[PDB]
Amino acid sequence: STGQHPARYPGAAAGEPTLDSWQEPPHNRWAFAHLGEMVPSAAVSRRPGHALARLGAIAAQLPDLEQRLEQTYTDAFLVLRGTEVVAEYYRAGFAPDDRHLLMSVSKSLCGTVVGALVDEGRIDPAQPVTEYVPELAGSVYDGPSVLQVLDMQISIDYNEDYVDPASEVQTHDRSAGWRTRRHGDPADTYEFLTTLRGDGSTGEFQYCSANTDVLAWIVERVTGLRYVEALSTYLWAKLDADRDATITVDTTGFGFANGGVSCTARDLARVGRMMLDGGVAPGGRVVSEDWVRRVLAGGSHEAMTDKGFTNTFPDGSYTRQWWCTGNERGNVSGIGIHGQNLWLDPLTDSVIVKLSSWPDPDTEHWHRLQNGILLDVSRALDAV
Template sequence: MTGTAWTSAGMSEPATARGRQLRERGMDQERPTIDTWQDPPFNRWTFSHVDEFVTSVSISTGRERSQKAVNDLDAFSGKVPELERRLAQTWTDVILVVHEDRIVGEWYGEGSRPDDRHLLMSVSKSICGIVVGALADDGLIEPSRTVAHYIPELAESAYGTATVQQVLDMTVAVEYLEEYADLNSHVRAHDRVAGWRTRFDTDPRDTHEFLMGLRPAGEHGKVFQYCSANTDVLAWLVEVVTGKRYHEVVGERVWSRLDAQSDARITVDSSGFAFANGGISCTARDLAGVGRLMLAGGEFDGRRIVSDGWVRATMAGGDPEAARGLPYQDIHPNGSYKNHWWATGNERGSVYAVGIHGQYVWLDPPTRTVIVKFSSAPEALGRTMNSDHARLFQELCAALE
């Protein structure tokens, strides 16, 4: 990365106290590194330039079209209070609202453009859920079978006796600490192995070896445990049953069938294995196609991508009791997780995909609305931020009724 690129594009902070303070302290003169690119203030720029730090490959759509910004939220004027302030407060880079397959609201923050690919973080997991569903539809994957049935290399790991469905629903009992700020956590080691941070000499060689080393932590299928490793197990499974690399299957099975305007990108480790749990980058308009697909029961413009049965099961959600007592249910009391998607359990049947630092795809079935939001929040997680987003999305959807 050149100094010019960072100076001209990297510090396009919103007019907030944080942005002013950082500039006053001269932080705009620093350069992001492999160990700081995910941190503020750098993430404002790096989340749209991931492949300058981490090796990435294309998820092909077979086309590339230039897009123009609209920057128009007039449809919500007077209906959603203090919208501009709330977008700034939640560190918004892009927000896009699609109602009945038509864009009705779109806003790009300073330095963001429609052609920019933005890192999805764990929204990537929900795309993986669709891919696995499509392969299950074709009989290539049977969700009730154990992971070891398909991947013998994982027989002695935590995943050996877990079923594919338990992996999809995150009810695998595995020793895996998903604490992003803990330098000694499993998720940090996972990042290092994937090439997202500087490797330690003691780290596994690649993601396959890392997954084989994860140990069981109880009985599977009883308790919801959010674990990013689960998604990479599914990606490995996808490669085994198709004989192709994960990114190729996503391109063939999903991206090329969504009429996406441009290729997506996904980071890969030293062996070329994709970081399926968080490594996809794409444009907001293309990601909206994933939401449209779900609201249309697995079809996109008349093309079947995944079965209606798979989508209905996903939208219905999982077992709320499996997540009982978790902070998620402070916001969504009947919330659950199914097929790598979050179900709110609210009266509207809203379902969503979410990634750290504020990445969202929110689905509102009654109004057939998809909301895509890209953000560069300074913290990875925050209960207040999650509830702020939920309220904002609900108000945007209500304004379209």
């Protein structure tokens, strides 16, 4: 058993409704107002083919920028300097106000919700995961602290060989509804997390999406809110965003915290703006000044042994669901597969959002090109 979870609506039984019960009372009152949470759905546009390039002033310093964005399969690109949008690009077929999947940039948003609860004193990172989710006893998450989950410093037997259906990475997707279920699969994301094991060692960075979903589970047990609602209450609703975000949900309504958020490029930039404003957003403080400082400061360098990161950023690290380059500019970024970045350039008080669809999730080739663009754009913002 995985214990108590937030009801889908007031008074709802555990796990209700399902795809097979949403038309029945009392579920249908909620379901008729939220059917997209149950059944895949398409937008029917209220509005009745060419790329939009407004690269502004940086165009002079980067003459080939649009071509470089095309080459890295850029869907949406936006540069926010201070409070001003100083450059934008959107591919043909993608509107400025269209939403885009964030993949693991979603993790940085989840970490922010955790940080909000730390600021309120409702989560103590020094406490073991099991203080908040006792049901994770007996798993790899029995022993580690919440901070070790935040910094991803837990050794976990988590096969990343996606093509193999036996792999933890594909099983995670199937448990959450991102892929077709196979017989015997865990019923939901919570159950999948409880199946995870490790040798018990901690302290070395291991990037693992399961960690973020454990964070979301902790958020739910602490607040009593669905992660979907907590993500709004503690972050999204304070941003003065143009549009709602969306997040995929599994069969229990649990948001896929590690990777399933979609939003507009301009709205994602508001998250970066909040980080560069010491944790404060238009709707109020989101996280503490200290939390932001710790993110910008980085994690333990010795923990970071991922050569896919350190080959480019030798002094890099990871903390609280953010990648920290440790470069001379102090750049920090949310990163998601296929070319998603929420990139912070504190030196110029700027945020760069790049949302993409590389044909491949993660190769040295694509990262070299993408990081070259982000760094060139960052430097183009320097006073001269």
